[PDB]
Symmetry: C4
Subunit: 236 residues, 4 copies
């Protein structure tokens, strides 16, 4: 039990453990590539047993379930294994296949279950030493970042309402309502700035200028929040 | 008096005070949602007693006025109650309902008062300690932010003048005048960058490149201003 | 001499000096507003004595020349009066009127001399206490800003070359040559991001992705340069 | 040998050394300008001996090869000469001419070798005192910048998948597949924001809003990484 546990959990234990970690990384990358390529227009049909993409998916899922079963059996205690995030992300990454397999042997639910496979990238943090530190740094500042998001929501509602009320007098305005102007306000406060929605009126232009100024303010506001978490997790 | 105080003002004093604060936050959120929703194209008519949006608005306004009256009567000092901003934001948020009610029982004046109701968001700062801290941090750096805004205005005027004078030789130019170029210059100095207004001439392109460089400078500039206020209120 | 000095130069000396400084600020603002408003299509025709804009310009120029002559006569040293930038910005701002007046009593030369009036904003630095400090902060980091501009130029040339050579295989590409791609590359490295020029090819999209990443790098790069100048002039 | 080595690679050795460095900078700039101007439509043909754009190239390449040969012959040892980056970049800068010359005396391969001439800019680092410091600062932070790029890739894959799956129900959507959405997700996470690809659905707009928020996060992320490298290489 301990031997296989250190073989599958500690890649630095031996060369075989490093090989296992490398093959796990390769399988994760292959599954991600297959998931991305499956949606290409020239590959989709208008699934089945003979589909090569299906075969690669079965191989990846078989490896994932074998690794998960081995780790669960070799875990020192079941509660810790079931409570660890790096294992819950793995158990979420396998269920969408099994739901699909049951139908082989309503479209609204099909929209989300096929989506959940994107989380396959998340066990890369296990094998990436730097990514664990980055995740810890992000988590340590999650409260202040949430507060910043709340402030951004306040500003986005303010500017959306202002621009809609200043643009109500234009017959060709894109802003039909504040819920419609939310997209523009959040794409302005965060400095992306698509050309698909811009004010045309003078008052709308003034409100947009104020929103752009607030966006300049808010693109630099979380910088001190990132500091004192970064430069802090690297020296101690 | 003192019984209903520390209860309508201090949620942490008792469970009843926490319940009152929670219901106040819920009413604020409901009023904000109703304000944003009522202008949707499928909801607006082309007000009245039977309108459900009107009923929810009356409920929210009744709760707001009851809370404001209770707080005013229970305050230990009438002088500072009016001077406090957290109460002026409350008293502004109730006026537009009463103006609307009088007409039920110049159109430009009607649009601004309707916009005034959007200040309902600001009472959320009372129940959010983090928002109070963020507001204090922003207020502590108001003067330097104003200086930065003045510098941005100087740059925006300079670049609008430059781009208009460089673009005067093009018959298809969007920049008809310096006020027209103001929108583009403030959209460039801020890194939003809409595609609705771009120079087409070579000299216009050079001026736009210089404006973009100055925009990188002007949004990388207020970072140290936010610092020494953040990381300062959280450490002292 | 010394009586009108410390009065035309030091507003804080007496109430009369403060009044003179206030009237100078008002004249500068009026001249700037008139300059911006003169180019509006409604006011422009398709100059003369009876033009109200011309009258306001003559009043502003008369005040400027009177103030400059008084300051020059009252200065204790003629050598440094010309060398000081706050006086050279004044002396450029008066020239365009005199050139225009001579014609009333090659068109490319006419557009630049009209343009150079934009520098009327810069005398506001004399009467703004914080603008001088901000200018000193910017000047103290001029060399590193120039280094950053040189790096940005290197990156812009590299990415323009890459995108043009990866996009020449498309008949509908906007990039006709490296100078054409310069505009897109400097619009991408700076995070303005206009939609007027975007790659359409796959290789063009990859090069654009790399340019956008380098743009994030180059917009986050000058922040430490602004620091150690800001927070340095405010503490020492 | 040592005398000419000091004359060539040490611009501070004498006035002649400074002259040699200046002429090398001038030749590099001339080659860059010629390379950029060669692709202009007014100059391209639809090469030969009489082409002036070929003669300037021959002169630049002759100077480059003379300098390279002199430096190689005057070097103290061959290993460091062939291992130093500022010399290997010179090696890459001369080969493309010789390949072109052979043909005068598979088309895609002929195009990439033309592209690789862009590296002519990189010899400017030798003669720029501050560019070496900037390169050292960038190199010292390359390990963490790679991790940041990896995080950006994870986020870009996640958001591309989310936006494609949310936008699958729209017949007019621009997102045909996850690789198509990769361009938009990069353009969003980096705060550039072209208007060529935007979601139109409500769920697509929500996913785009989340991607923009994460883009603000990822543009604020690398600032602390640049610090502790800057302000560190310039003080010790
Ligand atoms: K931006
Ligand atoms: K943009």
């Amino acid at each position: 039990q301990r031997k296989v546990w250190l073989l599958f959990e500690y890649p630095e234990s031996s060369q075989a453990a490093r090989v296992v970690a490398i093959i796990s990384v390769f399988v994760i990358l292959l599954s991600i590539v297959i998931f991305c390529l499956e949606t290409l227009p020239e590959f989709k049909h208008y699934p089945d047993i003979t589909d090569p993409f299906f075969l690669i998916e079965t191989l990846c899922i078989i490896w994932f379930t074998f690794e998960l079963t081995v780790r669960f059996l070799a875990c020192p205690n079941k509660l810790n294994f079931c409570r660890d995030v790096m294992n819950v992300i793995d158990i979420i990454a396998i269920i969408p296949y099994f739901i699909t397999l049951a139908t082989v042997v309503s479209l609204a639910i099909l929209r989300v279950i096929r989506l959940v496979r994107v989380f396959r990238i998340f066990k890369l943090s296990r094998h990436s030493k730097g990514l664990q530190r980055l995740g810890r740094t992000l988590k340590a500042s999650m409260r202040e970042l949430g507060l910043l998001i709340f402030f951004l929501f306040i500003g986005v509602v303010l500017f959306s309402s202002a621009v809609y009320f200043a643009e109500a007098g234009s017959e060709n305005s894109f802003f039909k309502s504040i819920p419609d102007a939310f997209w523009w306000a959040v794409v302005t406060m965060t400095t992306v700035g698509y050309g698909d929605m811009t004010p045309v009126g003078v008052w709308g232009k003034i409100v947009g200028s104020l929103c752009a100024i607030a966006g300049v303010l808010t693109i630099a506001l979380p910088v001190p929040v990132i500091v004192s978490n970064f430069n802090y997790f690297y020296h101690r």
